């Protein structure tokens, strides 16, 4: 499957000055880690696709993201940055790679993990897309925003395996995990 995962504030914010608009949420991180890492097929791995700025925002000691195949998008880089598994020059190319026999027999889920520019392009993807949205239920000052989630085509799933849907809360900040699907 092809999947996008993001955390968004109530004002649809996703970034401020190259960082997250809110303080670190422990269970949001844990959820992200588990969902992107966990394959539904024994013997396969998941693949994460991210923009260049998001790659370099990961502390070097934690690159590549453990247990996942890490693919970075960049129009300018000539070889993969140290530690990355693949470098693609477009989202089209990255998705085409995942369809090659030697990735298809290796990869289960493909996850788009940001940043803003990649989400924008991923939100224009035709076909089957699932959006795993962590709703942070507060406004935060933001300078970059997640694209509109068009409810004409995305349906909020009432339940999803492995996803706690109840409202959560850390140091007074409420949040909840949602899953949307489109098939167009
Ligand atoms: N709330 C959340 O869940 C998340 C939020 N974010 C936020 O996003 C913001 C950063 O977003 P942004 O600046 O867009 O950074 P990105 O991580 O999307 O990196 C942008 C760079 O990636 C490359 N790139 C992106 N899309 C493509 C494409 N389709 N084809 C080829 N190259 C591509 C380009 O590299 P080049 O210049 O080399 O061509 C571009 O300059 C930050 O505020 C950050 O906190 C990030 C992740 C998760």
mmCIF file of C-alpha atoms in Angstrom, residues 19-184:
data_model
loop_
_atom_site.group_PDB
_atom_site.id
_atom_site.type_symbol
_atom_site.label_atom_id
_atom_site.label_comp_id
_atom_site.label_asym_id
_atom_site.label_seq_id
_atom_site.Cartn_x
_atom_site.Cartn_y
_atom_site.Cartn_z
ATOM 1 C CA UNK A 19 10.728 22.592 12.967
ATOM 2 C CA UNK A 20 7.445 21.251 14.361
ATOM 3 C CA UNK A 21 5.111 23.935 15.710
ATOM 4 C CA UNK A 22 4.473 22.091 19.018
ATOM 5 C CA UNK A 23 6.690 20.568 21.693
ATOM 6 C CA UNK A 24 7.661 16.871 21.328
ATOM 7 C CA UNK A 25 4.898 14.355 21.985
ATOM 8 C CA UNK A 26 6.173 10.991 23.146
ATOM 9 C CA UNK A 27 3.270 8.812 22.008
ATOM 10 C CA UNK A 28 3.007 10.617 18.683
ATOM 11 C CA UNK A 29 6.648 9.692 18.015
ATOM 12 C CA UNK A 30 6.050 6.103 19.185
ATOM 13 C CA UNK A 31 3.003 5.776 16.909
ATOM 14 C CA UNK A 32 4.934 7.156 13.932
ATOM 15 C CA UNK A 33 7.778 4.747 14.565
ATOM 16 C CA UNK A 34 5.541 1.699 14.893
ATOM 17 C CA UNK A 35 3.298 2.441 11.942
ATOM 18 C CA UNK A 36 6.127 3.219 9.521
ATOM 19 C CA UNK A 37 8.280 0.280 10.685
ATOM 20 C CA UNK A 38 5.752 -2.532 10.967
ATOM 21 C CA UNK A 39 5.410 -4.704 7.900
ATOM 22 C CA UNK A 40 2.227 -6.702 7.378
ATOM 23 C CA UNK A 41 4.185 -9.371 5.449
ATOM 24 C CA UNK A 42 6.827 -11.582 7.015
ATOM 25 C CA UNK A 43 10.146 -11.209 5.166
ATOM 26 C CA UNK A 44 9.397 -7.702 3.881
ATOM 27 C CA UNK A 45 10.324 -4.223 5.062
ATOM 28 C CA UNK A 46 8.564 -0.885 4.720
ATOM 29 C CA UNK A 47 9.968 1.997 2.720
ATOM 30 C CA UNK A 48 9.822 5.645 3.779
ATOM 31 C CA UNK A 49 10.017 8.524 1.294
ATOM 32 C CA UNK A 50 11.093 11.926 2.541
ATOM 33 C CA UNK A 51 12.333 15.286 1.262
ATOM 34 C CA UNK A 52 15.923 16.376 1.628
ATOM 35 C CA UNK A 53 15.297 18.860 4.450
ATOM 36 C CA UNK A 54 13.443 16.220 6.459
ATOM 37 C CA UNK A 55 16.379 13.778 5.997
ATOM 38 C CA UNK A 56 18.882 16.346 7.356
ATOM 39 C CA UNK A 57 16.515 17.206 10.234
ATOM 40 C CA UNK A 58 16.996 13.710 11.625
ATOM 41 C CA UNK A 59 19.954 13.748 14.028
ATOM 42 C CA UNK A 60 22.817 11.983 12.245
ATOM 43 C CA UNK A 61 23.058 9.350 14.993
ATOM 44 C CA UNK A 62 19.549 8.187 14.044
ATOM 45 C CA UNK A 63 20.012 8.038 10.248
ATOM 46 C CA UNK A 64 18.867 6.050 8.378
ATOM 47 C CA UNK A 65 15.603 5.529 10.243
ATOM 48 C CA UNK A 66 16.089 2.090 11.712
ATOM 49 C CA UNK A 67 14.267 -0.906 10.325
ATOM 50 C CA UNK A 68 12.983 0.885 7.203
ATOM 51 C CA UNK A 69 14.324 1.443 3.714
ATOM 52 C CA UNK A 70 14.995 5.207 3.504
ATOM 53 C CA UNK A 71 14.516 7.022 0.184
ATOM 54 C CA UNK A 72 15.276 10.751 -0.125
ATOM 55 C CA UNK A 73 13.893 13.057 -2.793
ATOM 56 C CA UNK A 74 16.183 15.771 -4.192
ATOM 57 C CA UNK A 75 16.500 17.448 -7.581
ATOM 58 C CA UNK A 76 20.095 18.550 -6.790
ATOM 59 C CA UNK A 77 21.894 15.720 -5.042
ATOM 60 C CA UNK A 78 23.917 13.449 -7.337
ATOM 61 C CA UNK A 79 24.266 10.384 -5.112
ATOM 62 C CA UNK A 80 22.384 9.327 -2.013
ATOM 63 C CA UNK A 81 23.361 11.314 1.090
ATOM 64 C CA UNK A 82 25.517 9.258 3.461
ATOM 65 C CA UNK A 83 23.327 6.661 5.165
ATOM 66 C CA UNK A 84 20.329 6.893 2.836
ATOM 67 C CA UNK A 85 19.374 3.812 0.829
ATOM 68 C CA UNK A 86 18.032 5.541 -2.275
ATOM 69 C CA UNK A 87 17.894 8.961 -3.874
ATOM 70 C CA UNK A 88 15.131 9.820 -6.328
ATOM 71 C CA UNK A 89 14.777 12.932 -8.465
ATOM 72 C CA UNK A 90 10.964 12.923 -8.453
ATOM 73 C CA UNK A 91 8.086 11.283 -6.609
ATOM 74 C CA UNK A 92 7.119 9.568 -9.896
ATOM 75 C CA UNK A 93 10.556 7.978 -10.089
ATOM 76 C CA UNK A 94 10.451 6.877 -6.442
ATOM 77 C CA UNK A 95 7.078 5.189 -6.878
ATOM 78 C CA UNK A 96 8.202 3.580 -10.150
ATOM 79 C CA UNK A 97 11.201 2.103 -8.336
ATOM 80 C CA UNK A 98 8.897 0.479 -5.751
ATOM 81 C CA UNK A 99 7.122 -1.321 -8.608
ATOM 82 C CA UNK A 100 10.295 -2.986 -9.924
ATOM 83 C CA UNK A 101 10.466 -6.714 -9.189
ATOM 84 C CA UNK A 102 13.458 -6.310 -6.820
ATOM 85 C CA UNK A 103 11.576 -3.802 -4.671
ATOM 86 C CA UNK A 104 8.145 -5.444 -4.939
ATOM 87 C CA UNK A 105 9.498 -8.693 -3.461
ATOM 88 C CA UNK A 106 11.247 -6.698 -0.720
ATOM 89 C CA UNK A 107 8.890 -3.890 0.344
ATOM 90 C CA UNK A 108 5.452 -4.073 1.935
ATOM 91 C CA UNK A 109 4.172 -0.564 2.739
ATOM 92 C CA UNK A 110 5.376 2.688 1.210
ATOM 93 C CA UNK A 111 5.090 5.676 3.586
ATOM 94 C CA UNK A 112 5.395 9.360 2.745
ATOM 95 C CA UNK A 113 6.854 11.030 5.843
ATOM 96 C CA UNK A 114 7.239 14.680 4.719
ATOM 97 C CA UNK A 115 8.138 17.476 4.567
ATOM 98 C CA UNK A 116 5.607 20.027 3.440
ATOM 99 C CA UNK A 117 6.655 19.993 -0.233
ATOM 100 C CA UNK A 118 6.450 16.168 -0.404
ATOM 101 C CA UNK A 119 3.045 16.092 1.265
ATOM 102 C CA UNK A 120 1.825 18.633 -1.285
ATOM 103 C CA UNK A 121 2.941 16.439 -4.161
ATOM 104 C CA UNK A 122 1.733 13.236 -2.498
ATOM 105 C CA UNK A 123 -1.723 14.796 -1.970
ATOM 106 C CA UNK A 124 -1.939 15.071 -5.779
ATOM 107 C CA UNK A 125 -1.334 11.318 -6.203
ATOM 108 C CA UNK A 126 -4.121 9.556 -8.171
ATOM 109 C CA UNK A 127 -5.383 6.193 -6.929
ATOM 110 C CA UNK A 128 -5.437 4.460 -3.587
ATOM 111 C CA UNK A 129 -4.017 6.609 -0.767
ATOM 112 C CA UNK A 130 -4.359 6.311 3.009
ATOM 113 C CA UNK A 131 -3.657 9.312 5.233
ATOM 114 C CA UNK A 132 -2.637 8.631 8.821
ATOM 115 C CA UNK A 133 -3.251 11.968 10.496
ATOM 116 C CA UNK A 134 -2.369 12.783 14.087
ATOM 117 C CA UNK A 135 -4.707 15.605 14.992
ATOM 118 C CA UNK A 136 -3.084 17.824 17.578
ATOM 119 C CA UNK A 137 -6.118 19.456 19.085
ATOM 120 C CA UNK A 138 -4.714 22.920 19.664
ATOM 121 C CA UNK A 139 -3.611 25.852 17.542
ATOM 122 C CA UNK A 140 0.094 26.471 17.118
ATOM 123 C CA UNK A 141 1.876 29.282 15.313
ATOM 124 C CA UNK A 142 2.842 27.830 11.952
ATOM 125 C CA UNK A 143 4.338 29.026 8.667
ATOM 126 C CA UNK A 144 3.568 25.922 6.649
ATOM 127 C CA UNK A 145 0.371 23.944 6.364
ATOM 128 C CA UNK A 146 -0.871 20.503 5.345
ATOM 129 C CA UNK A 147 -2.990 20.473 2.172
ATOM 130 C CA UNK A 148 -6.781 20.391 2.461
ATOM 131 C CA UNK A 149 -8.207 16.958 3.175
ATOM 132 C CA UNK A 150 -11.071 16.832 0.685
ATOM 133 C CA UNK A 151 -13.903 14.843 2.307
ATOM 134 C CA UNK A 152 -15.510 14.394 -1.105
ATOM 135 C CA UNK A 153 -12.814 11.843 -1.868
ATOM 136 C CA UNK A 154 -11.263 10.911 1.509
ATOM 137 C CA UNK A 155 -13.352 8.956 3.971
ATOM 138 C CA UNK A 156 -12.501 8.893 7.628
ATOM 139 C CA UNK A 157 -12.309 5.263 8.656
ATOM 140 C CA UNK A 158 -14.093 4.715 11.998
ATOM 141 C CA UNK A 159 -11.527 2.097 13.000
ATOM 142 C CA UNK A 160 -8.216 0.782 11.737
ATOM 143 C CA UNK A 161 -6.089 -2.175 12.899
ATOM 144 C CA UNK A 162 -3.402 -1.174 15.348
ATOM 145 C CA UNK A 163 -4.699 2.373 15.814
ATOM 146 C CA UNK A 164 -6.022 3.647 19.095
ATOM 147 C CA UNK A 165 -8.760 6.138 18.148
ATOM 148 C CA UNK A 166 -9.575 7.590 21.569
ATOM 149 C CA UNK A 167 -8.498 11.121 22.422
ATOM 150 C CA UNK A 168 -5.055 11.138 24.088
ATOM 151 C CA UNK A 169 -3.284 13.864 26.088
ATOM 152 C CA UNK A 170 0.348 14.810 27.056
ATOM 153 C CA UNK A 171 1.108 17.749 29.432
ATOM 154 C CA UNK A 172 -2.257 19.179 28.571
ATOM 155 C CA UNK A 173 -2.079 18.794 24.792
ATOM 156 C CA UNK A 174 -4.816 16.584 23.400
ATOM 157 C CA UNK A 175 -4.395 14.581 20.227
ATOM 158 C CA UNK A 176 -5.908 11.678 18.349
ATOM 159 C CA UNK A 177 -4.971 9.324 15.550
ATOM 160 C CA UNK A 178 -7.163 9.282 12.417
ATOM 161 C CA UNK A 179 -7.024 7.276 9.200
ATOM 162 C CA UNK A 180 -8.528 8.485 5.922
ATOM 163 C CA UNK A 181 -8.799 6.569 2.665
ATOM 164 C CA UNK A 182 -9.444 7.473 -0.917
ATOM 165 C CA UNK A 183 -9.842 5.188 -3.942
ATOM 166 C CA UNK A 184 -10.086 7.377 -7.105
#
